[PDB]
Design an enzyme around this catalytic site. Structure first.
Site, mmCIF file in Angstrom:
data_model
loop_
_atom_site.group_PDB
_atom_site.id
_atom_site.type_symbol
_atom_site.label_atom_id
_atom_site.label_comp_id
_atom_site.label_asym_id
_atom_site.label_seq_id
_atom_site.Cartn_x
_atom_site.Cartn_y
_atom_site.Cartn_z
ATOM 1 C CG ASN A 7 -4.462 -24.594 -1.383
ATOM 2 O OD1 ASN A 7 -5.519 -24.332 -1.849
ATOM 3 N ND2 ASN A 7 -3.764 -23.267 -0.878
ATOM 4 C CD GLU A 32 -6.462 -19.654 -0.493
ATOM 5 O OE1 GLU A 32 -5.169 -20.638 0.295
ATOM 6 O OE2 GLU A 32 -6.755 -21.081 -1.325
ATOM 7 C CG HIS A 80 -8.586 -23.152 -3.100
ATOM 8 N ND1 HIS A 80 -6.929 -23.188 -3.909
ATOM 9 C CD2 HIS A 80 -9.581 -23.096 -3.978
ATOM 10 C CE1 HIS A 80 -7.193 -23.018 -4.875
ATOM 11 N NE2 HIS A 80 -8.793 -22.370 -5.421
ATOM 12 C CG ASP A 105 -15.395 -17.039 -5.970
ATOM 13 O OD1 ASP A 105 -15.879 -17.443 -4.405
ATOM 14 O OD2 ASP A 105 -15.485 -17.824 -5.974
#
Length: 234
Positions: free
Chosen positions: A129, A136, A131, A63
């Protein structure tokens, strides 16, 4: 195939990751996929202090924030310099160009870099969560490199580091779930009680876009390094 290595804590898991990394290099690995965040920090420290030599190797990061130069102290490029590349540089290290004039050209470019340099070993963490990278819940398993809108929690957290509200990135260019799955081998590190629910969902739940990590159930060579607290549900 997903093997699980249960360890006492992050220090021990990081040492196991290091040994596994060294072995892959010895057996011919040439292109590494790297991680950001706190998860790989002790691993990177061990590498900085080691005899590993990346001079004939390529790295690819997942990223970069849209709008930040590689020199910006908030960039992932800078994070990687500080934590790894200054001490142990690669032949070439790739991150997305946050300053790209045409974001669609940049996502296409990154996909072609991944085709040119298929990753031999990807280091990965998992989100609270579930991810994976900036992918996501709800992200397509087919996703390649794409523009991601940062979560409002992320933006709020990152805002503390800028002037300057107008200066805070709201987006990232991120490798997708299909991108990440292309690695020949994935080493996923998960530490702490905060990761236990996500780890259980990844390992034991259905394969569903609600749990991005669940796609790793279908990868031919994933090794899960998890401490006792993160591994409590598996």
């Amino acid at each position: 195939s997903m093997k699980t290595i249960k360890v006492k804590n992050k220090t021990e898991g990081s040492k196991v990751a290091f040994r596994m990394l060294e072995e892959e290099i010895t057996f011919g690995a040439k292109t590494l996929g790297l991680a950001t965040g706190s998860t790989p920090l002790e691993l990177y420290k061990e590498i900085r202090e080691s005899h590993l030599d990346f001079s004939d190797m390529v790295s690819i990061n997942l990223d970069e924030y849209v709008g930040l130069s590689a020199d910006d102290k908030q960039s992932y490029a800078y994070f990687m310099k500080q934590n790894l590349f200054a001490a142990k540089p690669f032949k070439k290290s790739y991150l997305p160009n946050g300053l790209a004039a045409d974001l669609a050209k940049e996502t296409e470019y990154y996909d072609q870099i991944l085709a040119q340099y298929p990753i031999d070993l990807q280091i990965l963490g998992i989100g609270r969560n579930a991810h994976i990278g900036f992918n996501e819940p709800g992200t397509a398993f087919s996703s390649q490199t794409h523009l991601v809108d940062l979560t409002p929690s992320t933006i709020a957290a990152n805002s503390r580091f800028f002037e300057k509200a107008e200066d805070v990135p709201k987006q990232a260019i991120s490798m997708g779930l299909a991108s990440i799955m292309s690695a020949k081998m994935i080493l996923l590190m998960a530490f702490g009680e905060e990761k236990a629910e996500a780890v259980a969902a990844m390992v034991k739940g259905p394969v569903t876009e609600e749990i991005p990590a669940s796609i790793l159930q279908t990868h031919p060579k994933v090794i899960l390094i998890v401490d006792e607290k993160a591994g409590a549900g598996i």
